[PDB]
């Protein structure tokens, strides 16, 4: 098992490609605020053309979420925030 | 292990059948809001005869829940919301 | 591993008996509201003559709790609510 | 694996000794209120002469915490509350 | 597994170097308040050239976070608080 993480900025999708026979586990998403805002930051993941909401963050009420997410194939993280980045952390492991 | 997720819309149940000798793990349920609302979105699962509440979401107070649920047999997810979908995410694994 | 859950009603204790060499894992407790109420719903477990509080729920502030509880021997669940049931969910696994 | 739990009262530190080659996993701490109060109940553990905060409870805002704590050796639980007990629950398991 | 915990003070980074083929699992971060404050305490970790936000604590709203973090190599913890320490707790295990 190895540390993994990525910072996802406004208006940009991050593609993540697990290595063959490996997984990416996402444990947490946290706001990295840029400008003070009450905006709702909707987190999404796209896997094989399906886009699912994985939570809503906000600076004042929901600054982070703890998760038990597992990805065996390529996925794309994105969010609706414009006044924050979202930092995803977890780990890689064999599958 | 493999990524798993489903979107559950108002009024309709989603029936999920774990593959033979496999499990579905549900890790999170998150609101995908359609219209701004303070409604309570009661989440239920039906397994065998039995329907159980697995949490209450709301756009403003409880927009997601993190879970450690495991299903070995057919189950049905539904919710009482009318102004949001609920997106369930987790993973499949053996056993 | 197998799905497990129980509904615990006002004023009544629910007894749960793990089979020999099995465990019951409780993952979640959620309010199943009957009448709208601000009451505090204190959750208890009794195991071998010890009674312990395992959380306090409320419809408005704490409608559910996520847990990592393990029971290898008979136990009883009860709560102090009168305007809701509490639905406990998790799984059985080998011990 | 086996159920484990202990009640920790005001002004009483509780020593817990895992069995040899075993661990205690603490999964939850919950307030067992005695007198209605907004006090902050700071939970601490001491292991090997180091005392660390494991969380803060309160009757109104934080009545419980869910944990993934593991202790392989003797430890001591304590808290700062005077108007509640704290109930700690989890399990024992082998640790080889 | 073995108990692991560290106290991280204002203005000081804490470097951790796991043993080879071992990991540090961090399970929680909690404020150890020094003076009453509503400050936001932003938690960060550095792993090589990466620096990621791992949550935001506050004495009044977010005094602790529970998470599932894994570090296999050197890392450094820090936070932006000035009116509290942050206590990070988890366990060491083989990798
Ligand atoms: Na399994």
UniProtKB/Swiss-Prot annotation, chains A, B, C, E:
One of its GO terms (cellular component) is plant-type cell wall. Disulfide bonds: none annotated. Keywords: Acetylation, Chromatin regulator, Developmental protein, Hydrolase, Nucleus, Phosphoprotein, Repressor, Transcription, Transcription regulation. It is found in: Nucleus, Nucleolus; Nucleus. Expressed in leaves, roots, stems, young plantlets, flowers and siliques. Highest levels in ovules, embryos, shoot apical meristems and first leaves. Also expressed in somatic embryos. Probably mediates the deacetylation of lysine residues on the N-terminal part of the core histones (H2A, H2B, H3 and H4). Histone deacetylation gives a tag for epigenetic repression and plays an important role in transcriptional regulation, cell cycle progression and developmental events. This is Histone deacetylase HDT2. It comes from Arabidopsis thaliana.
